Subunit: 161 residues, 2 copies
């Protein structure tokens, strides 16, 4: 019997700071949870994928997801969210991106990410419980940008490093 699998550790990301992740390939990019009602696993899909089922381990649980990215040029981030510790995941939002950069921030009782389509990506907020203790698990290398420099973060998200 194969126990687990196990996961890289999560990071108690300080509030008011953007984590700017730079994944290079498809798969799970980052996971975030308030340990109460929101568990978010962000997956990345390369260009030119017509409908197929892929397997991901989300918070250590192996799940099959039917994925699609018809764009020939943009990569596609997909927010997979469950709302109970044992619950099923569903797609809650997406980011279509030429830059392959993803952002996550804990701020003012909310978890913030970017959604939409570069170069016009815009932020999305989720109300969470005990937001300062939200755990963020990066599967990618990342940079940290203060919220005071959010205009710079928006520029990287939309136009690249």
């Amino acid at each position: 019997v194969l126990d687990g699998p196990y996961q890289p550790a999560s990071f108690d990301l300080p509030v008011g700071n953007w984590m700017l992740l730079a994944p290079t390939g498809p798969g799970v990019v980052v996971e975030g949870t308030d340990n109460s009602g929101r568990w978010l696993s962000v997956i990345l899909i390369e260009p030119g994928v017509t409908s197929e089922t892929r397997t991901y381990t989300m918070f250590g649980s192996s799940k099959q997801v039917l994925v699609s990215n018809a764009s020939d040029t943009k990569w596609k981030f997909v927010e997979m969210m469950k709302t109970a510790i044992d619950g099923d995941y569903a797609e809650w939002g997406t980011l279509l991106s030429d830059t392959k950069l993803y952002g996550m921030m804990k701020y003012r009782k909310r978890l913030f990410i970017y959604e939409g389509e570069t170069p016009n990506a815009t932020t999305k907020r989720y109300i969470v419980t005990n937001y300062a203790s939200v755990e963020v698990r990066p599967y990618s290398d990342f940079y940290i940008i203060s919220r005071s420099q959010e205009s710079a973060c928006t520029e990287y998200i939309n136009n690249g490093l």
Copy 2:
């Protein structure tokens, strides 16, 4: 000036255990170092990649590597090794794989990995300093298989889960 790159969390891999990583996409798979003379960054290349330069962040620094994978079916793991903290990386070994599973173990003054070509992949040992404190940094979820069950790890590496 960007604050980073930061990396996924290092993992305290107990001696005498195979970390069996399950990456889903191209990019860095795992990094291992004795902080003395060996810094190993394992990169994964998808099938059907003609010679091209890709950027990876290796031990927290951006690096360009010329990569290729002529196989149309097998994924290719590449061991990029430097021997000084300042040094350049070179390819030291490879694993061609239909399973996309990669193993790493700290054992008997050595760092062990698999090399070759599935379904006949075989282990390789690197002498390292202070092997029990070698730092291991996973970029995906992973299983843990004791060395006493290495026959099972060999089966998974070569034939899948």
